[PDB]
Coordinates of C-alpha atoms in Angstrom, one line a residue:
Chain A
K4 CA 239.9 85.1 22.1
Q5 CA 241.2 88.0 20.1
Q6 CA 244.8 87.0 20.6
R7 CA 246.3 83.8 21.8
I8 CA 249.0 84.5 24.4
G9 CA 251.7 82.2 25.7
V10 CA 253.5 82.8 29.0
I11 CA 257.0 81.2 29.1
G12 CA 258.0 81.1 32.8
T13 CA 255.1 81.7 35.1
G14 CA 256.6 83.5 38.1
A15 CA 255.3 86.8 39.6
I16 CA 255.8 88.8 36.4
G17 CA 254.6 86.2 34.0
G18 CA 251.6 85.2 36.1
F19 CA 250.5 88.8 36.8
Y20 CA 250.6 90.0 33.1
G21 CA 249.2 86.7 31.9
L22 CA 246.3 86.9 34.4
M23 CA 245.6 90.5 33.6
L24 CA 245.5 89.8 29.9
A25 CA 243.3 86.7 30.5
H26 CA 240.9 88.9 32.5
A27 CA 240.7 91.2 29.4
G28 CA 239.3 88.2 27.3
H29 CA 242.5 86.9 25.7
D30 CA 243.2 83.2 25.5
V31 CA 246.3 82.8 27.8
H32 CA 248.3 79.6 28.1
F33 CA 250.8 79.3 31.0
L34 CA 254.0 77.3 30.7
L35 CA 255.1 76.3 34.3
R36 CA 258.8 75.5 34.9
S37 CA 258.6 75.0 38.7
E38 CA 255.0 75.6 39.8
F39 CA 252.8 73.4 37.5
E40 CA 251.2 70.9 39.7
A41 CA 250.6 73.5 42.4
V42 CA 249.2 76.2 40.0
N43 CA 247.3 73.6 37.9
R44 CA 245.1 72.4 40.8
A45 CA 245.1 75.7 42.9
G46 CA 244.8 78.2 40.0
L47 CA 246.2 81.7 39.7
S48 CA 245.1 84.3 42.3
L49 CA 246.0 88.0 42.4
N50 CA 246.1 90.0 45.6
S51 CA 246.4 93.5 44.1
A52 CA 246.2 96.9 45.8
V53 CA 245.6 98.5 42.4
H54 CA 243.1 96.1 40.7
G55 CA 241.6 94.3 43.7
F56 CA 241.4 90.5 43.9
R57 CA 241.5 88.6 40.6
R58 CA 241.4 84.9 40.0
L59 CA 241.9 82.6 37.0
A60 CA 240.6 79.1 37.7
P61 CA 241.0 76.8 35.9
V62 CA 244.4 77.8 34.4
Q63 CA 245.5 76.6 31.0
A64 CA 248.8 75.3 32.5
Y65 CA 251.4 73.2 30.7
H66 CA 254.6 71.6 31.9
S67 CA 256.1 71.1 28.4
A68 CA 256.2 73.8 25.7
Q69 CA 255.3 71.2 23.0
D70 CA 251.9 70.7 24.5
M71 CA 251.1 74.4 24.1
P72 CA 249.1 75.7 21.1
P73 CA 250.6 78.1 18.6
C74 CA 250.4 81.5 20.3
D75 CA 250.5 85.0 18.7
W76 CA 252.3 86.7 21.6
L77 CA 254.8 84.9 23.8
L78 CA 255.5 86.7 27.1
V79 CA 258.7 85.7 28.9
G80 CA 258.4 86.6 32.6
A81 CA 261.2 84.3 33.7
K82 CA 264.5 85.6 35.0
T83 CA 267.2 86.3 32.5
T84 CA 269.3 83.6 34.2
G85 CA 267.4 80.9 32.3
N86 CA 267.3 82.7 28.9
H87 CA 269.8 80.3 27.3
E88 CA 267.3 77.4 27.4
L89 CA 264.5 79.7 26.3
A90 CA 264.8 79.4 22.5
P91 CA 263.4 75.8 22.0
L92 CA 260.5 76.7 24.3
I93 CA 259.6 79.8 22.4
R94 CA 259.9 78.1 19.0
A95 CA 257.7 75.2 20.2
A96 CA 255.0 77.6 21.4
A97 CA 255.2 80.2 18.6
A98 CA 252.6 80.6 15.9
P99 CA 254.0 81.7 12.5
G100 CA 255.4 85.1 12.9
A101 CA 254.7 85.3 16.6
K102 CA 255.9 88.3 18.7
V103 CA 258.3 87.5 21.5
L104 CA 258.2 90.0 24.4
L105 CA 260.9 89.7 27.1
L106 CA 259.4 91.1 30.3
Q107 CA 262.9 91.1 31.7
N108 CA 265.3 93.6 33.3
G109 CA 269.0 94.2 32.5
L110 CA 270.9 95.1 29.4
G111 CA 271.5 93.3 26.1
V112 CA 268.9 90.7 26.9
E113 CA 267.3 90.6 23.4
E114 CA 270.7 90.6 21.6
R115 CA 271.7 87.5 23.6
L116 CA 268.5 85.5 22.7
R117 CA 268.2 86.5 19.0
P118 CA 270.9 84.1 17.7
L119 CA 268.7 81.1 18.4
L120 CA 265.4 82.7 17.6
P121 CA 264.1 82.0 14.0
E122 CA 264.3 85.1 11.8
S123 CA 260.5 85.0 11.3
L124 CA 259.8 85.9 14.9
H125 CA 259.7 89.4 16.2
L126 CA 261.7 90.1 19.3
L127 CA 260.6 92.8 21.7
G128 CA 261.5 94.0 25.2
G129 CA 259.2 95.1 28.0
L130 CA 260.4 97.1 30.9
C131 CA 258.0 96.5 33.8
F132 CA 257.7 99.2 36.5
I133 CA 255.8 97.0 39.0
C134 CA 255.9 95.9 42.6
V135 CA 255.0 92.2 42.5
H136 CA 256.2 89.0 44.2
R137 CA 255.1 85.4 44.9
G138 CA 253.3 84.7 48.1
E139 CA 251.7 81.3 48.7
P140 CA 251.9 78.9 45.7
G141 CA 249.6 80.2 42.9
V142 CA 249.1 83.6 44.6
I143 CA 250.5 86.8 43.2
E144 CA 251.1 89.8 45.5
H145 CA 250.7 93.1 43.6
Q146 CA 251.6 96.1 45.7
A147 CA 251.9 99.0 43.2
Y148 CA 252.3 100.1 39.6
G149 CA 252.4 97.6 36.7
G150 CA 253.2 99.8 33.7
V151 CA 255.1 98.2 30.7
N152 CA 257.4 100.1 28.4
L153 CA 257.6 98.1 25.1
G154 CA 260.4 98.3 22.5
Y155 CA 261.2 96.5 19.3
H156 CA 264.6 94.8 19.0
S157 CA 264.7 92.7 15.8
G158 CA 262.6 90.7 13.4
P159 CA 261.2 90.7 9.8
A160 CA 259.4 94.0 10.2
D161 CA 260.3 97.3 8.5
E162 CA 260.2 100.6 10.4
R163 CA 256.5 101.3 9.9
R164 CA 255.6 97.7 10.8
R165 CA 257.9 97.8 13.9
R166 CA 256.1 100.8 15.3
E167 CA 252.7 99.1 14.6
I168 CA 253.8 96.0 16.4
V169 CA 255.1 97.8 19.5
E170 CA 251.8 99.8 19.5
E171 CA 249.9 96.6 19.2
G172 CA 251.6 95.1 22.3
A173 CA 251.0 98.3 24.2
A174 CA 247.3 98.2 23.3
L175 CA 247.1 94.7 24.8
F176 CA 248.3 95.9 28.2
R177 CA 246.3 99.1 28.0
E178 CA 243.0 97.3 27.2
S179 CA 243.8 95.1 30.2
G180 CA 243.7 98.1 32.6
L181 CA 247.5 98.4 32.6
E182 CA 249.5 101.5 31.7
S183 CA 251.8 100.9 28.8
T184 CA 254.0 103.0 26.5
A185 CA 255.5 102.3 23.1
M186 CA 259.2 103.2 23.3
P187 CA 261.1 104.4 20.2
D188 CA 264.4 103.1 21.4
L189 CA 264.5 99.8 23.3
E190 CA 268.2 100.0 24.3
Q191 CA 267.7 103.5 25.7
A192 CA 264.7 102.3 27.6
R193 CA 266.8 99.5 29.1
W194 CA 269.3 102.0 30.3
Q195 CA 266.5 103.9 31.9
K196 CA 265.3 100.9 33.9
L197 CA 268.9 100.1 35.0
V198 CA 268.9 103.4 36.9
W199 CA 266.4 101.9 39.3
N200 CA 267.3 98.2 39.2
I201 CA 271.1 98.6 39.7
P202 CA 271.0 100.5 43.0
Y203 CA 267.8 99.1 44.5
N204 CA 268.2 95.4 43.7
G205 CA 271.8 95.3 44.9
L206 CA 271.5 97.5 47.9
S207 CA 268.4 95.6 49.1
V208 CA 270.5 92.5 49.2
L209 CA 273.7 94.0 50.4
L210 CA 272.1 96.1 53.2
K211 CA 269.4 93.5 53.7
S212 CA 266.8 96.2 53.5
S213 CA 263.7 97.3 51.6
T214 CA 262.8 100.5 49.8
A215 CA 261.3 102.4 52.7
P216 CA 264.3 102.0 55.1
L217 CA 266.7 102.6 52.2
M218 CA 264.9 105.9 51.3
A219 CA 264.4 106.9 55.0
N220 CA 268.1 106.7 55.9
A221 CA 270.0 109.7 54.6
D222 CA 273.3 107.8 53.9
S223 CA 271.7 105.0 51.9
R224 CA 269.7 107.7 50.0
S225 CA 272.8 109.5 48.9
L226 CA 274.4 106.2 48.0
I227 CA 271.4 105.3 45.8
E228 CA 271.6 108.8 44.1
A229 CA 275.4 108.4 43.5
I230 CA 274.8 105.0 41.9
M231 CA 272.0 106.4 39.8
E232 CA 274.4 109.1 38.5
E233 CA 276.9 106.4 37.6
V234 CA 274.3 104.6 35.5
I235 CA 273.1 107.8 33.9
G236 CA 276.7 108.7 33.1
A237 CA 277.5 105.2 31.7
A238 CA 274.4 105.5 29.5
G239 CA 275.5 108.9 28.3
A240 CA 279.0 107.5 27.5
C241 CA 277.5 104.7 25.4
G242 CA 275.4 107.2 23.4
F243 CA 272.1 107.4 25.3
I244 CA 271.4 110.7 27.2
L245 CA 268.6 110.0 29.7
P246 CA 265.9 112.5 30.7
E247 CA 266.9 115.5 32.8
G248 CA 266.2 114.9 36.4
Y249 CA 265.5 111.2 35.8
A250 CA 267.2 110.3 39.1
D251 CA 264.9 112.7 41.0
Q252 CA 261.9 111.2 39.4
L253 CA 263.0 107.7 40.4
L254 CA 263.8 108.8 43.9
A255 CA 260.5 110.6 44.3
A256 CA 258.4 107.7 43.0
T257 CA 260.2 105.3 45.2
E258 CA 259.5 107.4 48.3
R259 CA 255.7 107.4 47.5
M260 CA 256.1 103.7 46.9
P261 CA 255.0 101.2 49.6
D262 CA 257.7 99.2 51.4
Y263 CA 259.0 96.8 48.7
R264 CA 261.5 94.0 48.5
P265 CA 263.0 93.9 45.0
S266 CA 263.0 90.7 43.1
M267 CA 266.7 90.2 43.8
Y268 CA 266.0 90.4 47.5
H269 CA 263.5 87.5 47.2
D270 CA 266.0 85.6 45.0
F271 CA 268.7 85.8 47.6
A272 CA 266.5 84.7 50.4
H273 CA 265.1 81.8 48.4
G274 CA 268.6 80.8 47.2
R275 CA 267.9 81.5 43.6
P276 CA 270.7 82.7 41.3
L277 CA 270.8 86.5 41.1
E278 CA 270.5 88.3 37.8
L279 CA 274.0 89.8 38.1
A280 CA 274.9 89.1 34.5
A281 CA 272.2 91.1 32.9
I282 CA 271.8 93.9 35.5
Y283 CA 275.5 94.4 36.5
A284 CA 278.0 92.6 34.3
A285 CA 276.6 93.7 31.0
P286 CA 276.3 97.5 31.7
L287 CA 279.7 97.3 33.4
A288 CA 281.4 95.8 30.3
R289 CA 279.6 98.2 28.0
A290 CA 280.8 101.2 30.0
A291 CA 284.3 99.7 30.2
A292 CA 284.3 99.4 26.4
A293 CA 283.5 103.2 26.3
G294 CA 286.2 104.0 28.8
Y295 CA 283.7 104.9 31.5
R296 CA 284.3 103.6 35.0
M297 CA 281.3 102.9 37.4
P298 CA 283.3 102.4 40.6
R299 CA 280.3 102.1 43.0
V300 CA 278.4 99.8 40.7
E301 CA 281.6 97.7 40.1
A302 CA 282.1 97.5 43.9
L303 CA 278.4 96.7 44.5
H304 CA 278.7 94.0 41.8
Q305 CA 281.7 92.5 43.5
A306 CA 280.0 92.5 46.9
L307 CA 276.9 90.7 45.5
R308 CA 279.1 88.1 43.8
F309 CA 280.9 87.6 47.1
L310 CA 277.6 87.3 49.0
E311 CA 276.2 84.7 46.5
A312 CA 279.3 82.6 47.0
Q313 CA 279.3 82.7 50.8
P314 CA 277.5 79.9 52.7
Chain B
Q6 CA 311.0 106.2 82.0
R7 CA 307.7 105.8 83.9
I8 CA 305.0 104.6 81.6
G9 CA 301.2 104.9 82.1
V10 CA 298.5 103.0 80.1
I11 CA 295.4 105.1 79.9
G12 CA 292.7 102.5 79.3
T13 CA 294.0 98.9 79.4
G14 CA 292.2 97.5 76.4
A15 CA 293.6 95.1 73.8
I16 CA 296.1 97.6 72.4
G17 CA 297.1 99.3 75.7
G18 CA 297.2 96.0 77.6
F19 CA 299.4 94.3 75.0
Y20 CA 302.0 97.1 74.7
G21 CA 301.9 97.9 78.4
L22 CA 302.6 94.3 79.3
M23 CA 305.4 93.9 76.7
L24 CA 307.0 97.1 78.0
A25 CA 306.6 96.0 81.6
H26 CA 307.9 92.5 80.9
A27 CA 311.1 94.1 79.5
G28 CA 311.7 95.8 82.9
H29 CA 310.0 99.1 82.3
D30 CA 308.0 100.7 85.1
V31 CA 304.4 100.6 83.7
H32 CA 301.3 101.8 85.5
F33 CA 297.9 100.5 84.2
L34 CA 294.7 102.4 84.5
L35 CA 291.7 100.1 84.4
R36 CA 288.3 101.7 83.6
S37 CA 285.7 98.8 83.3
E38 CA 287.5 95.6 84.3
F39 CA 289.7 96.7 87.2
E40 CA 288.3 94.0 89.4
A41 CA 289.5 91.0 87.5
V42 CA 293.0 92.4 86.7
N43 CA 293.7 93.5 90.3
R44 CA 294.2 89.9 91.6
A45 CA 295.1 87.6 88.8
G46 CA 297.2 90.2 87.0
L47 CA 297.5 90.6 83.2
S48 CA 298.2 87.6 81.0
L49 CA 299.1 87.4 77.3
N50 CA 298.4 84.5 74.9
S51 CA 300.6 85.3 71.9
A52 CA 301.2 83.1 68.9
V53 CA 304.4 85.1 68.4
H54 CA 305.7 85.9 71.9
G55 CA 304.1 83.1 73.8
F56 CA 302.4 83.1 77.2
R57 CA 303.4 85.9 79.6
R58 CA 301.8 86.9 82.9
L59 CA 302.3 90.2 84.8
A60 CA 302.0 89.6 88.6
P61 CA 301.7 91.7 90.5
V62 CA 300.5 94.6 88.2
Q63 CA 300.6 98.3 89.2
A64 CA 296.9 98.9 88.6
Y65 CA 295.0 102.1 89.4
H66 CA 291.2 102.8 89.5
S67 CA 291.5 106.6 88.9
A68 CA 293.9 108.6 86.8
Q69 CA 294.3 110.8 89.9
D70 CA 295.9 107.9 91.8
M71 CA 298.5 107.3 89.1
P72 CA 302.0 108.7 89.6
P73 CA 303.3 111.3 87.1
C74 CA 304.2 109.3 84.0
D75 CA 306.7 110.3 81.3
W76 CA 305.0 108.2 78.6
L77 CA 301.3 107.7 78.3
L78 CA 300.1 105.0 75.9
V79 CA 296.5 105.5 74.6
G80 CA 295.1 102.4 72.9
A81 CA 291.4 102.9 73.3
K82 CA 289.0 103.5 70.4
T83 CA 289.2 107.0 69.0
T84 CA 285.5 107.7 69.7
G85 CA 286.2 108.2 73.5
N86 CA 289.3 110.4 73.0
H87 CA 287.4 113.5 74.3
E88 CA 286.4 111.8 77.5
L89 CA 290.0 110.5 77.8
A90 CA 291.6 114.0 77.8
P91 CA 291.2 114.6 81.6
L92 CA 292.6 111.1 82.3
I93 CA 295.7 111.9 80.2
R94 CA 296.2 115.2 81.9
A95 CA 295.9 113.9 85.4
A96 CA 298.4 111.1 84.8
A97 CA 300.8 113.2 82.8
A98 CA 304.2 114.4 84.2
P99 CA 305.6 117.7 83.1
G100 CA 306.6 117.4 79.5
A101 CA 305.1 113.9 79.2
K102 CA 304.9 112.1 75.9
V103 CA 301.4 111.1 74.8
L104 CA 301.4 108.2 72.3
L105 CA 298.1 107.6 70.6
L106 CA 298.2 103.9 69.6
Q107 CA 295.1 104.5 67.5
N108 CA 294.0 104.2 63.9
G109 CA 292.4 106.7 61.6
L110 CA 293.4 110.2 60.4
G111 CA 293.6 113.5 62.2
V112 CA 293.4 111.8 65.6
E113 CA 296.1 113.9 67.3
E114 CA 294.8 117.2 65.9
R115 CA 291.3 116.6 67.3
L116 CA 292.8 115.8 70.8
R117 CA 295.5 118.6 70.8
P118 CA 293.1 121.4 72.0
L119 CA 292.3 119.3 75.0
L120 CA 296.0 118.7 76.0
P121 CA 298.4 121.3 77.4
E122 CA 300.8 122.6 74.8
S123 CA 303.7 121.5 77.1
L124 CA 303.0 117.9 76.3
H125 CA 304.3 116.0 73.3
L126 CA 301.6 114.4 71.2
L127 CA 302.7 111.3 69.2
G128 CA 301.0 108.8 67.0
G129 CA 301.6 105.1 67.1
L130 CA 300.4 103.0 64.1
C131 CA 300.0 99.4 65.3
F132 CA 300.1 96.7 62.6
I133 CA 298.8 94.0 64.9
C134 CA 296.1 91.4 65.3
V135 CA 295.0 91.5 68.9
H136 CA 291.8 91.2 70.9
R137 CA 290.5 91.0 74.4
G138 CA 289.7 87.5 75.6
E139 CA 288.9 86.6 79.2
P140 CA 289.1 89.5 81.6
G141 CA 292.8 90.2 82.2
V142 CA 293.8 88.0 79.2
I143 CA 295.1 89.5 75.9
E144 CA 295.0 87.3 72.8
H145 CA 297.7 88.2 70.3
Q146 CA 297.6 86.4 66.9
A147 CA 300.1 88.1 64.6
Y148 CA 302.5 91.0 64.0
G149 CA 302.7 93.8 66.6
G150 CA 305.0 96.4 65.1
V151 CA 304.5 100.0 65.8
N152 CA 305.4 103.0 63.6
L153 CA 305.8 106.1 65.7
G154 CA 305.5 109.7 64.5
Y155 CA 305.6 113.2 66.0
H156 CA 302.5 115.4 65.8
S157 CA 302.6 118.4 68.1
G158 CA 304.5 119.8 71.1
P159 CA 307.3 122.2 72.3
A160 CA 310.1 120.2 70.7
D161 CA 312.1 121.5 67.8
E162 CA 312.8 119.4 64.7
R163 CA 316.0 117.9 66.3
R164 CA 314.3 117.2 69.6
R165 CA 311.3 115.7 67.7
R166 CA 313.5 113.0 66.0
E167 CA 315.0 112.2 69.4
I168 CA 311.6 111.7 71.1
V169 CA 310.2 109.5 68.3
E170 CA 313.4 107.5 68.3
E171 CA 313.2 107.2 72.1
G172 CA 309.7 105.8 71.9
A173 CA 310.7 103.4 69.1
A174 CA 313.5 102.2 71.4
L175 CA 311.0 101.5 74.2
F176 CA 309.2 99.0 71.9
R177 CA 312.2 97.5 70.1
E178 CA 314.0 96.8 73.4
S179 CA 310.8 95.0 74.6
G180 CA 311.1 92.6 71.7
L181 CA 308.7 94.3 69.2
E182 CA 309.4 95.7 65.8
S183 CA 309.2 99.5 65.8
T184 CA 310.2 102.2 63.4
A185 CA 310.6 106.0 63.8
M186 CA 308.6 107.7 61.0
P187 CA 309.6 111.2 59.9
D188 CA 306.1 112.1 58.8
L189 CA 303.2 111.0 61.1
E190 CA 300.5 112.1 58.7
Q191 CA 302.1 110.0 55.9
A192 CA 302.4 107.1 58.3
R193 CA 298.7 107.3 59.2
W194 CA 297.8 107.3 55.5
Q195 CA 299.7 104.0 55.0
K196 CA 297.9 102.4 57.9
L197 CA 294.6 103.6 56.4
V198 CA 295.2 101.4 53.3
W199 CA 294.5 98.4 55.6
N200 CA 291.9 99.6 58.0
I201 CA 289.7 101.3 55.4
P202 CA 289.0 98.1 53.3
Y203 CA 289.3 95.4 55.9
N204 CA 287.5 97.0 58.9
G205 CA 284.5 98.1 56.7
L206 CA 284.2 95.1 54.5
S207 CA 284.4 92.8 57.5
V208 CA 281.3 94.5 58.9
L209 CA 279.5 95.0 55.5
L210 CA 280.1 91.5 54.2
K211 CA 279.9 89.9 57.7
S212 CA 283.2 88.3 57.0
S213 CA 286.8 87.9 58.3
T214 CA 290.1 88.4 56.6
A215 CA 290.6 84.8 55.3
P216 CA 287.2 84.5 53.5
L217 CA 287.7 88.1 52.2
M218 CA 291.1 87.0 50.7
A219 CA 289.9 83.6 49.5
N220 CA 287.1 85.0 47.3
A221 CA 288.3 86.6 44.1
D222 CA 285.6 89.3 44.0
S223 CA 286.2 90.5 47.6
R224 CA 290.0 90.5 46.9
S225 CA 289.5 92.6 43.8
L226 CA 287.3 94.9 45.9
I227 CA 289.9 95.3 48.7
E228 CA 292.6 96.1 46.1
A229 CA 290.4 98.7 44.4
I230 CA 289.7 100.3 47.8
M231 CA 293.4 100.2 48.6
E232 CA 294.3 102.0 45.4
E233 CA 291.8 104.7 46.2
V234 CA 293.5 105.2 49.6
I235 CA 296.9 105.2 48.0
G236 CA 295.7 107.8 45.4
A237 CA 294.1 110.0 48.0
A238 CA 297.3 110.0 50.1
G239 CA 299.3 111.0 47.0
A240 CA 296.8 113.7 46.2
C241 CA 297.6 115.2 49.6
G242 CA 301.3 115.0 48.9
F243 CA 302.3 111.6 50.5
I244 CA 303.9 109.0 48.2
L245 CA 303.3 105.6 49.7
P246 CA 305.8 102.8 49.3
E247 CA 305.9 101.0 45.9
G248 CA 303.7 97.9 45.7
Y249 CA 302.2 98.8 49.1
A250 CA 298.9 97.3 48.2
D251 CA 300.5 93.9 47.2
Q252 CA 302.6 94.2 50.4
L253 CA 299.5 94.5 52.7
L254 CA 297.7 91.8 50.6
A255 CA 300.7 89.5 51.1
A256 CA 300.8 90.0 54.8
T257 CA 297.1 89.6 55.1
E258 CA 297.3 86.4 53.1
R259 CA 299.8 84.9 55.6
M260 CA 298.2 85.9 58.8
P261 CA 295.4 83.8 60.4
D262 CA 291.7 84.6 60.1
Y263 CA 291.2 87.9 61.9
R264 CA 288.1 89.8 62.9
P265 CA 289.0 93.5 62.9
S266 CA 288.3 96.0 65.6
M267 CA 285.2 97.3 63.8
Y268 CA 283.7 93.8 63.4
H269 CA 283.6 93.2 67.1
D270 CA 282.4 96.7 67.8
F271 CA 279.4 96.3 65.4
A272 CA 278.6 92.9 66.7
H273 CA 278.5 94.0 70.4
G274 CA 276.7 97.2 69.6
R275 CA 279.6 99.5 70.2
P276 CA 279.8 102.7 68.1
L277 CA 282.1 102.3 65.1
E278 CA 285.2 104.3 64.6
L279 CA 283.8 105.7 61.3
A280 CA 284.8 109.3 62.1
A281 CA 288.6 108.7 62.2
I282 CA 288.9 105.9 59.7
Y283 CA 286.4 107.0 57.0
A284 CA 285.0 110.5 57.5
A285 CA 288.4 112.2 58.1
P286 CA 290.3 110.8 55.1
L287 CA 287.2 111.4 52.9
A288 CA 287.1 115.1 53.9
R289 CA 290.9 115.4 53.6
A290 CA 290.8 113.9 50.1
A291 CA 287.8 116.1 49.1
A292 CA 289.8 119.2 50.2
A293 CA 292.6 118.1 47.9
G294 CA 290.2 117.6 45.0
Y295 CA 290.4 113.8 44.9
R296 CA 287.4 111.5 45.0
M297 CA 287.3 108.0 46.7
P298 CA 283.9 106.7 45.4
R299 CA 284.2 103.2 46.8
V300 CA 285.4 104.4 50.2
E301 CA 282.6 107.0 50.2
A302 CA 280.0 104.3 49.3
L303 CA 281.5 102.0 51.9
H304 CA 281.3 104.7 54.6
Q305 CA 277.6 105.4 53.6
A306 CA 276.7 101.7 53.9
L307 CA 278.4 101.4 57.3
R308 CA 276.5 104.4 58.6
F309 CA 273.3 102.8 57.3
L310 CA 274.0 99.5 59.0
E311 CA 274.8 101.3 62.3
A312 CA 271.4 103.1 62.1
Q313 CA 269.5 99.8 61.6
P314 CA 268.1 97.9 64.6

């Protein structure tokens, strides 16, 4: 054990990164909200096209955060919908001055969790470009990618120490065989990830499709691109100019990608609440504050809200 | 005068029967359910006008068999208008009036090169909830009014107002609300404010009018789409009535749960009327330098859904 790592919320994201870190020799402890008794006896298994089959058995699984030991890094892989009840779990599992890394999508996530996080804890964001989902209980299906873009949000660190901490988190993933990048601007990096999540998550639910049919059809492809330009323009209006041709890079990488159902697709099929607040409502309100309209995203958001309310 | 119904669908059947029930001489052309009508007749189940039956009914299997008609009502889906052109020509009398009881934009101009220039081409915008039930049975749930406008033909401006008013009198004397519109293109834009949101969202959200109006998010979406259509119409010079969006929303609130034309078409595998209802007003708005992002996105999603198995 070089670093003790706690995983708050052990879904596909939390289980994957926690297992990859554990396979690198770190002491990883998994907090299970919904899957404890299954995962505890079965273990954690990884079906990965990138890294091959991996397994962690037995798992250091816990059903209550108080049972967990003080960890140096807390990785939150849970959905942003349960972030309001996250603070007592993090505080219960955190070693003094622990680093909290939200492996979560959307916008404004860290800012909404900080009020109830002790000032002595560092708060970081991690934007995961990864194709992963839950198969059988305790089994993790990894189809592609896995890179993590880390950014610092808040905490007791000065500017030099902030860069060192982000670099430290990136080294954890890199030594685990995962690509990872220290980002200089977490909020800019969150806008960059929205360019993929906003069209693909919502259209996969709305059109009940996956990435390959969405990219194959010419009309859905133009719709994705127009939505991407809305997010790019909303980011620009709020002060963040994204890389040139960023939409083309996302479109090109998604074509090469295997057929993938986004996490929101799985959420809707399993009846789980969709991450509309972080992925849609928050960027819509930020753009509205800057006087920038996102008509397709706003309509896509209204449709998803309708679909979630329908029987 | 003599009235022919080219394609006795839900629209043509309803308006043909109402005209015939008022004493007019109506001649129905049946293309795919001639067998059932030519015995039992045509029956109407109307929550407004009640139960009416036409028996016997002047039914024809071929447009060649029909007598020359002075009025030709066309109520079929716009996708088959090209195939319908020989039918209209065969049943048309000299100087006949062709009334396209069809939705969308640019419908008459796309049919005009296939019709003789001696014929008058009119548009009829039907604010009506109607669908085919049993063979020979027309189910009418609400409304039924027709707004008539002149498109093309040999008539001068004075003769154009007389012909539109003559057609409006046909329907009004049959017990239907009907208005003569001075601008057919403006009249088509105002009907698009309903068809564009309700027809597409009913397919996209797999919903009908009542659940779309009961949910606040779908209602906000419909209103935003309506404002895009109102803005695109104004960008092309046509000022729509004040509070027109709230007007349509109010009439949709009162009417019973309705599955639009496009919903039934998508469910039964029929090709959707995307060209006339979405592609044409989008291209017309683009030429006027006005964007309709929600309508464009809606059109793209519908085309995707149509291409899916």
